[PDB]
Amino acid sequence: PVRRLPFSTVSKQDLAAFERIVPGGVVTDPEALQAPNVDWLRTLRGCSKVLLRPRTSEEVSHILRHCHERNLAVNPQGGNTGMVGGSVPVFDEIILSTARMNRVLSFHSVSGILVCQAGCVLEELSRYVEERDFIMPLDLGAKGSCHIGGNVATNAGGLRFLRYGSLHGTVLGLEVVLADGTVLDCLTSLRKDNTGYDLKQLFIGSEGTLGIITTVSILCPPKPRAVNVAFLGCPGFAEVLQTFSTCKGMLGEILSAFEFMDAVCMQLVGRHLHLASPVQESPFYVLIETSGSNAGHDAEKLGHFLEHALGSGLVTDGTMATDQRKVKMLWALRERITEALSRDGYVYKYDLSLPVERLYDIVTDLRARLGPHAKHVVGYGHLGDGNLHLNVTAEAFSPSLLAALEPHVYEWTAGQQGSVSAEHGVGFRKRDVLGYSKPPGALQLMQQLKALLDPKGILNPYKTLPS
Amino acid sequence: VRRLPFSTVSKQDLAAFERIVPGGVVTDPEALQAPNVDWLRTLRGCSKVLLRPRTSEEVSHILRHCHERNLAVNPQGGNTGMVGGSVPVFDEIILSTARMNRVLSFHSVSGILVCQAGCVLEELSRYVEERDFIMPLDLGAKGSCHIGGNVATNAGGLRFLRYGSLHGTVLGLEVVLADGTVLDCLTSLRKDNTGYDLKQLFIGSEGTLGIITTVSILCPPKPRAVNVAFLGCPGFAEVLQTFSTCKGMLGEILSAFEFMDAVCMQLVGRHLHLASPVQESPFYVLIETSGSNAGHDAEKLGHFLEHALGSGLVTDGTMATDQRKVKMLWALRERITEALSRDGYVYKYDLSLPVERLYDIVTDLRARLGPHAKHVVGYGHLGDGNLHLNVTAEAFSPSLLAALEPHVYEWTAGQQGSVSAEHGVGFRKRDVLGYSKPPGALQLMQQLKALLDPKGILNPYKTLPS
Ligand SMILES: Cc1cc2nc3c(=O)[nH]c(=O)nc-3n(C[C@H](O)[C@H](O)[C@H](O)COP(=O)(O)OP(=O)(O)OC[C@H]3O[C@@H](n4cnc5c(N)ncnc54)[C@H](O)[C@@H]3O)c2cc1C
Ligand SMILES: Cc1cc2nc3c(=O)[nH]c(=O)nc-3n(C[C@H](O)[C@H](O)[C@H](O)COP(=O)(O)OP(=O)(O)OC[C@H]3O[C@@H](n4cnc5c(N)ncnc54)[C@H](O)[C@@H]3O)c2cc1C
Ligand SMILES: O=C(O)CC[C@@H](O)C(=O)O
Ligand SMILES: O=C(O)CC[C@@H](O)C(=O)O
Ligand SMILES: [Zn+2]
Ligand SMILES: [Zn+2]
């Protein structure tokens, strides 16, 4: 397995130092450390003996100062919803939680610029800005637990990426505490600013290996006057692809989401979450969201789109909603697939960028390659962005199934010049499969960046660069 | 200010470059005159060698040689940059991307364009528009600027309000590092979270961390309907309320919101012989929309104009959808900087400020300089909080400079603003970044420069503080 690097260990003197630095924010009880030591998938468990819960940036600076002097490894943690083992310790790394860094600093009701602490929960920020007629530029099924700082650190994609784009575009600024405790102020709450290198970009998607994000400045789109959702059954993946093409051609700028899922996804959400399907049974389903300023115009656009889709046989059955309750019910069928999967058994999870025309090939292939050894195989996800969520469920983990899946899936993906981690990132699980998507020289430059910014390697060791 | 201890180009270096780039070694002093002078004609180098590589490998071998020989290199694109970054200070070798102008691929479904860094922006716009796509950025310099220079400077421009930053729209880069190492981050994927987003370091790095040789970029679909409204507003309060109403009533179809004052209109009319299409007003607003249903857009515009004219925010306005008149109206805005450079010496500031006080500095400067300036103008990308502030004089005055600087930068800092929103830093602004950046940021910038280019051969005297 992996070998523990020669870090120090937490002493009683370290515990007293942390008690000084963050009064009331030191958790040492072994039973309390159980939950923060286990990842969301429940397949990785750390042995951390101390949880720190600072409230302020200065406390994070001082914690890291101490850990730097003492050579203590630190595991940053947000909502602990990450999918790649990046969020929990491997050995006895200190868990530094942002749970209590949950304050909004300011919100400007004209520019739409939000500034908040890294540990603000995404759904709560959404409620906050929606009260002021804005929205968050990203959303995901983990919204109820994930922290904005986690989202920035993982460069989270999500359900409205197609409309508002990457955090690399929507993050306006960051405050980041470096491994030695230096507070890096890149908190430029300005729409535009070309005064030197865009240092904050290094910390977007770096998963806590280059520094700990403590404050975020983010551009919030205006809240749309009109939101529509359509949920459609398609008789094959070719019709899904043509439905996408037609959807872009007829809805255009009002399109805010395009998600697909297969029949098995629908069956699992129905069986485990008791969610009835609102359309006729089909081998594929598509959820489309639109967001716009004029309800009448959006309705005309959608009506004509539906007319054409049903006319040319791209869609066999479809339903539409504007009522918030019904919209949420329809969205639940897509958002909760991952939960139903984790309720179905042990989950093998792959998050791939592929040519959209070939997005589903791997699922049919794996259904053939695997047999009754797979309990289920599913494909779903962000088709508009070329992003497939591939999942295999089984009664239990088995080495034989892992050996059938890997490296086969990663070589198929490399054969398509795809990404073996479209959005979930690298972390612990994928640290040794980056060669399928990144050339050696890039990986080396990444290693040099790590050495420059964290020469002691105390920030999230065993991740997210190759060994 | 003072020349760093770089080597000097010998006859053997010339013979090596002739081996590396046959046909691409320019040493004629008269041919070297134009590439040594920046667009503003206020900086002029003494470079004696211009290199014009064709391929990425030629660039790699050139930089390998310069690394072994400790020769400074000045990358140059279209040479339209505004901050003295694009021309040597002394005798840096000018490496031009002029011949690196081929498109490599374009995926007719994803809209992803892969092209060499020296492709001119206008030409790329033509290419992708022939295929029903558009570039995610546009600039007044479109006719000359290179996509490599746009990425190196993180160019903003006239459709930034709709499509946003190159940090979002650039999908991949091939970069040649100072020692010749070719860094391949030339992915063509919409989403790829397999490690650090290294390409981001080179977007806005102004050639100090590496030479961009290949760009992969996401082109938005070409709009079915483009509309432009050119409106006259009786004051800046009404400009700001017009902006708010525009966002409320046009929404997602909005693709541009630009403003200019009366003096800008007078200067473009005088020097460029472009007549105003609207009544004389203290302020003018150019609104562009882009949409998929021309009728819905036209209806939105109708209701917007009716409301704006009815509530007194706009006094008189003209709209255009014909491509020719659209380009005429856009020309009234795009060529202001040229009319200014024909009015005499130009003091140029590019500031990010709170939109609600975007114009306050123009009024302040007009009171502060009164008759010692020829003109003070404010215009630009109001939707993005970005003011272009220009002062013209019949000739340069150290007096007027002392009146403008540091005052303007201090004012900006007082607004927690940016002293260079878009155009960047280059040579001109290397020592005024402290008004927008704290010392720890600038130090980390210097550490990255030292990691990527320890000899400092790439673009010396830029773009970090002295
Ligand atoms: C139901 C569900 C749906 C999801 N949907 C999506 C989706 O649509 N798109 C998508 O991209 N992902 C999705 N995810 C996974 C996604 O990575 C997480 O939901 C989220 O982005 C991470 O937030 P977090 O606070 O839980 O981070 P954590 O899991 O706590 O940590 C993530 C990583 O970043 C580091 N980190 C955390 N906080 C900080 C910080 N403040 N500073 C520095 N480093 C830090 C951690 O060390 C770790 O390596 C989903 C997950 C679930 C469970
Ligand atoms: C009329 C006019 C209008 C303009 N409008 C705008 C506007 O709306 N928005 C805006 O942001 N800017 C605008 N600009 C200025 C803008 O910075 C440049 O026009 C544009 O960004 C491209 O510059 P360029 O291709 O000429 O690069 P150059 O001027 O040749 O170079 C600019 C800088 O980038 C570096 N560089 C160039 N090519 C490369 C390369 N391949 N690799 C690495 N480094 C490189 C150079 O060393 C230099 O430091 C305008 C300029 C003019 C003259
Ligand atoms: O669990 C998964 O594979 C996908 C989860 C998440 O990224 C989603 O978009 O639903
Ligand atoms: O020269 C200027 O002040 C601004 C130039 C350019 O960014 C423009 O938008 O006109
Ligand atoms: Zn996802
Ligand atoms: Zn500009």
PDB file of C-alpha atoms in Angstrom, chain B residues 53-56 76-80 96-106 113-128 135 137-139 141-152 155 166 173 186 211-217 219:
ATOM      1  CA  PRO B  53       9.287  31.061 -36.616  1.00  0.00           C
ATOM      2  CA  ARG B  54       6.771  28.914 -38.468  1.00  0.00           C
ATOM      3  CA  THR B  55       6.272  26.001 -36.039  1.00  0.00           C
ATOM      4  CA  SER B  56       6.343  25.242 -32.320  1.00  0.00           C
ATOM      5  CA  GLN B  76       5.575  39.952 -30.147  1.00  0.00           C
ATOM      6  CA  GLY B  77       2.135  39.443 -31.668  1.00  0.00           C
ATOM      7  CA  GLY B  78       0.133  42.091 -33.522  1.00  0.00           C
ATOM      8  CA  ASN B  79       1.988  44.805 -31.543  1.00  0.00           C
ATOM      9  CA  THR B  80      -1.260  46.547 -30.557  1.00  0.00           C
ATOM     10  CA  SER B  96       7.336  37.310 -33.854  1.00  0.00           C
ATOM     11  CA  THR B  97       4.407  34.916 -34.282  1.00  0.00           C
ATOM     12  CA  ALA B  98       3.517  36.529 -37.636  1.00  0.00           C
ATOM     13  CA  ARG B  99       4.059  33.331 -39.640  1.00  0.00           C
ATOM     14  CA  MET B 100       2.455  31.025 -37.041  1.00  0.00           C
ATOM     15  CA  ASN B 101      -0.946  31.739 -38.543  1.00  0.00           C
ATOM     16  CA  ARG B 102      -2.488  28.358 -39.454  1.00  0.00           C
ATOM     17  CA  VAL B 103      -5.722  26.890 -38.118  1.00  0.00           C
ATOM     18  CA  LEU B 104      -5.101  23.288 -37.040  1.00  0.00           C
ATOM     19  CA  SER B 105      -8.650  22.002 -36.453  1.00  0.00           C
ATOM     20  CA  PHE B 106     -12.250  23.061 -35.888  1.00  0.00           C
ATOM     21  CA  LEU B 113     -11.066  25.939 -32.411  1.00  0.00           C
ATOM     22  CA  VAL B 114      -7.395  24.945 -32.333  1.00  0.00           C
ATOM     23  CA  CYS B 115      -5.109  27.441 -34.042  1.00  0.00           C
ATOM     24  CA  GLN B 116      -1.585  28.790 -33.921  1.00  0.00           C
ATOM     25  CA  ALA B 117      -0.883  31.736 -31.628  1.00  0.00           C
ATOM     26  CA  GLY B 118      -0.173  34.150 -34.486  1.00  0.00           C
ATOM     27  CA  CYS B 119      -3.602  33.915 -36.116  1.00  0.00           C
ATOM     28  CA  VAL B 120      -5.079  37.411 -36.365  1.00  0.00           C
ATOM     29  CA  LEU B 121      -8.344  37.790 -34.448  1.00  0.00           C
ATOM     30  CA  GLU B 122     -10.330  39.276 -37.358  1.00  0.00           C
ATOM     31  CA  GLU B 123      -9.229  36.409 -39.608  1.00  0.00           C
ATOM     32  CA  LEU B 124     -10.310  33.839 -37.013  1.00  0.00           C
ATOM     33  CA  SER B 125     -13.666  35.592 -36.653  1.00  0.00           C
ATOM     34  CA  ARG B 126     -14.129  35.343 -40.425  1.00  0.00           C
ATOM     35  CA  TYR B 127     -13.137  31.657 -40.374  1.00  0.00           C
ATOM     36  CA  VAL B 128     -15.511  30.603 -37.586  1.00  0.00           C
ATOM     37  CA  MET B 135     -15.013  34.189 -31.290  1.00  0.00           C
ATOM     38  CA  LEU B 137     -13.901  37.950 -27.577  1.00  0.00           C
ATOM     39  CA  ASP B 138     -13.663  40.981 -29.838  1.00  0.00           C
ATOM     40  CA  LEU B 139     -11.550  44.137 -29.744  1.00  0.00           C
ATOM     41  CA  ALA B 141      -7.583  45.856 -32.563  1.00  0.00           C
ATOM     42  CA  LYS B 142      -9.207  42.814 -34.242  1.00  0.00           C
ATOM     43  CA  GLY B 143      -7.520  43.639 -37.570  1.00  0.00           C
ATOM     44  CA  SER B 144      -3.990  43.239 -36.204  1.00  0.00           C
ATOM     45  CA  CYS B 145      -3.995  41.513 -32.813  1.00  0.00           C
ATOM     46  CA  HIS B 146      -2.946  37.865 -32.542  1.00  0.00           C
ATOM     47  CA  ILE B 147      -4.867  35.268 -30.544  1.00  0.00           C
ATOM     48  CA  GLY B 148      -1.606  34.504 -28.744  1.00  0.00           C
ATOM     49  CA  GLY B 149      -1.352  38.127 -27.664  1.00  0.00           C
ATOM     50  CA  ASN B 150      -4.997  38.132 -26.584  1.00  0.00           C
ATOM     51  CA  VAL B 151      -4.372  35.112 -24.352  1.00  0.00           C
ATOM     52  CA  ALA B 152      -1.048  36.480 -23.056  1.00  0.00           C
ATOM     53  CA  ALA B 155      -7.836  40.568 -23.334  1.00  0.00           C
ATOM     54  CA  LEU B 166     -10.451  33.918 -21.574  1.00  0.00           C
ATOM     55  CA  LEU B 173      -2.564  25.955 -24.589  1.00  0.00           C
ATOM     56  CA  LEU B 186      -3.511  21.639 -25.400  1.00  0.00           C
ATOM     57  CA  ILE B 211       5.661  31.808 -25.261  1.00  0.00           C
ATOM     58  CA  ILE B 212       2.182  30.637 -26.238  1.00  0.00           C
ATOM     59  CA  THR B 213       2.404  28.718 -29.510  1.00  0.00           C
ATOM     60  CA  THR B 214      -0.976  26.985 -29.841  1.00  0.00           C
ATOM     61  CA  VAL B 215      -4.433  27.926 -28.537  1.00  0.00           C
ATOM     62  CA  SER B 216      -7.566  25.798 -28.141  1.00  0.00           C
ATOM     63  CA  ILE B 217     -10.625  27.962 -27.469  1.00  0.00           C
ATOM     64  CA  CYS B 219     -16.262  29.469 -29.885  1.00  0.00           C
TER      65      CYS B 219
END
